[PDB]
Design an enzyme around this catalytic site. Structure first.
Site, PDB file in Angstrom:
ATOM      1  N   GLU C 106       0.839  -1.196   0.000  1.00 59.49           N
ATOM      2  CA  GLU C 106       0.000   0.000   0.000  1.00 59.49           C
ATOM      3  C   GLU C 106       0.884   1.259   0.000  1.00 59.49           C
ATOM      4  O   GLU C 106       0.559   2.260  -0.642  1.00 59.49           O
ATOM      5  CB  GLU C 106      -0.990  -0.020   1.185  1.00 59.49           C
ATOM      6  CG  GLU C 106      -1.943  -1.206   1.105  1.00 59.49           C
ATOM      7  CD  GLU C 106      -2.960  -1.301   2.240  1.00 59.49           C
ATOM      8  OE1 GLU C 106      -2.665  -1.937   3.270  1.00 59.49           O
ATOM      9  OE2 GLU C 106      -4.068  -0.793   2.070  1.00 59.49           O
ATOM     10  N   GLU C 126      -4.820  -9.184   3.637  1.00 56.79           N
ATOM     11  CA  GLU C 126      -5.734  -8.976   4.779  1.00 56.79           C
ATOM     12  C   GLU C 126      -6.891  -9.967   4.844  1.00 56.79           C
ATOM     13  O   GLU C 126      -7.212 -10.445   5.934  1.00 56.79           O
ATOM     14  CB  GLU C 126      -6.303  -7.545   4.795  1.00 56.79           C
ATOM     15  CG  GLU C 126      -5.481  -6.552   5.598  1.00 56.79           C
ATOM     16  CD  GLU C 126      -4.185  -6.186   4.910  1.00 56.79           C
ATOM     17  OE1 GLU C 126      -4.040  -6.437   3.683  1.00 56.79           O
ATOM     18  OE2 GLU C 126      -3.302  -5.644   5.597  1.00 56.79           O
TER      19      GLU C 126
END
Lengths: 252, 251, 252
Positions: C106, C126
């Site tokens: 990210e 995730e």
């Protein structure tokens, strides 16, 4: 005669088969309504995480059943042509073999991921008849493959194969003809290993984010994230990880 | 002769920038003639598709700086030719040789691209401390991968038709000198189809990028309605069912 | 103990190095604050045009430092995880080697350009723990590589290499392992050769244009362009070009 839409639950996978092989799985009233109901079932059942849509007999979908429509059947449901206009919330994989033109291509485009036999055929031919595709193909194709390729295809109305579209990332898995469903099943299993609500929330963020103001994008995301972070599944994910064992997901 | 040449071939409008000695830079006569061509294309029911190309083996060197500096009002009501308000009907760029700067922005205002292998594109404004302002920055990152468009915009470096073919920026990649001929075949594939249909398909593809999801099908529907009641729509069904070619009217 | 974020200026390039190789350059509070202040320094200093962000000791960033989060450190800065939620205004290149998962990925997606060693490893895992990635990966990955491939990776959580990702335009320079920084510096020099204000405004239009109504897009661009046209660098750029000499930029 067997149901025109078959529905089978395999653990957290819902397998949806259009079942009109002799009509190459064209969408009449029973197919449109059956596909809408499968979508509802997928999204409303906690023990489902992912769907696969495929066609009986080595063809995916010839699109709208013109004969059924001309006789007086309604081909649209509350979700459009099957679910073109309002696809399900949970992840759905199209497992495509053979003929998938027109409304079939638009139904493929309403899905999130595509597994296809290499000879599978797609297309948006409406302009050939002086018509324009209205079941979302023009809204979505230009966002899945390069803009000018989608434009070319939409303006000429020409057909294209899974094999040709694979270079553009439109075909998550390109396999030999006849292998799409078993391959889709494997891909579905990779997803259903993951947190049910987490995979749904991920999809949602990915679809909705292209509508959000940049100023609001993080807050909007955060609204969707919150229930996930405090979910029972989120607890089990951490617990299972600490205990060196598989998580047991519940969808809450 | 005229600095912009216009020729109709059945349903195709062929638009040629005609300043070969100036590598087809855009002065006032060029910008105005390209804007007038766009108006003719869009107002003539008997045209469906345009092709824009450059005389003498170059597409367009962009803004004519001598014209700009001597005080020519180079921008038309549609921008640099038609960069800012491109035509409504489909248009193909047939690109050879030099297509830099404004010329690349002109290409990007088109819908499809046919190029000679050696055609040279680029957005070099930053090299001079300027920013590309005729749409390049609004469109290039939606036609090739975001980070490649970013890179090209920040370095200002040139890239060829051959390099860009890898990204779906080049609909037909041809030997140099063959772009116009191949664009004419591509155009014929499109003029075969319903005039109103091809324009409306383009319209939806462009305008959909800025629709709210919850209103996208309703907005789309407003564009489809005139089509489904069109005379061409009826002719398309009757021609198919009589196993013959359709005769289009653009109504 | 050395600084957790190293900062070095080479001409108009700010080199930002995450310096906790013991922890594979995971982001704790010290790293997050260091990264945010490095962004600030880039953006406020007229003699800087571009940054490079990289990790010390052969990997980029392992993402959120879990030990740190668990113990109570307020890891998120004003700009997110380092600067994930509010990245720098000026152009920034990620020079990525080795492990770059999760939060690291990210962080990479918050940059504008990527140079990577071929064995560099990215991912948004995730969902595997019943979580959703919240540092912008889901807002950004689908606009850097094809939609359905981004969707897939988001839903599976599967790691992917720079080598794998290069086909999608996610890697501006794919290089041998160990060469990412050297190559990033060469790319940065190609950018710093150009007007500082012009490169920053070019980036801004590219980012912000995504959210403009079409009928306003040229007017909004026009606003960002006006300061460029009358800038001193604009004059210098034309005179340096004319003379065929290196322009000497000022950042005004």
């Amino acid at each position: 005669m067997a149901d025109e839409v078959l529905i089978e639950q395999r653990d957290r996978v819902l397998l949806i088969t259009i079942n009109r092989p002799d009509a190459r799985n064209a969408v009449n009233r029973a197919v449109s309504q059956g596909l809408a109901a499968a979508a509802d079932q997928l999204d409303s059942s906690a023990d489902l995480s992912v769907a696969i849509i495929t066609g009986a007999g080595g063809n995916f979908c010839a699109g709208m059943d013109l004969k059924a429509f001309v006789s007086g059947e309604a081909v649209l449901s509350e979700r459009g042509l099957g679910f073109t206009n309002v696809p399900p919330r949970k992840p759905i994989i199209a497992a495509v073999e053979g003929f998938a033109l027109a409304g079939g291509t638009e139904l493929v485009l309403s899905c999130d991921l595509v597994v296809a036999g290499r000879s599978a055929k797609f297309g948006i031919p409406e302009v050939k008849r002086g018509l324009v595709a209205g079941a979302g193909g023009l809204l979505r194709l230009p966002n899945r493959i390069p803009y000018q390729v989608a434009m070319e295809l939409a303006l000429t109305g020409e057909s294209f194969t899974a094999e040709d579209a694979a270079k553009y990332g439109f075909i998550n898995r390109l396999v030999d003809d006849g292998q799409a469903l078993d391959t889709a099943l494997e891909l579905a299993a990779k997803i259903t290993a993951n947190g049910p609500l987490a995979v749904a929330a991920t999809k949602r963020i990915i679809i909705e984010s292209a509508s959000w103001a940049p100023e609001e994008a993080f807050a909007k995301q955060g609204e969707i994230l919150m229930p996930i972070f405090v979910s029972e599944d989120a607890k089990e994910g951490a617990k299972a990880f600490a205990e060196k064992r598989a998580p047991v997901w519940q969808g809450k």
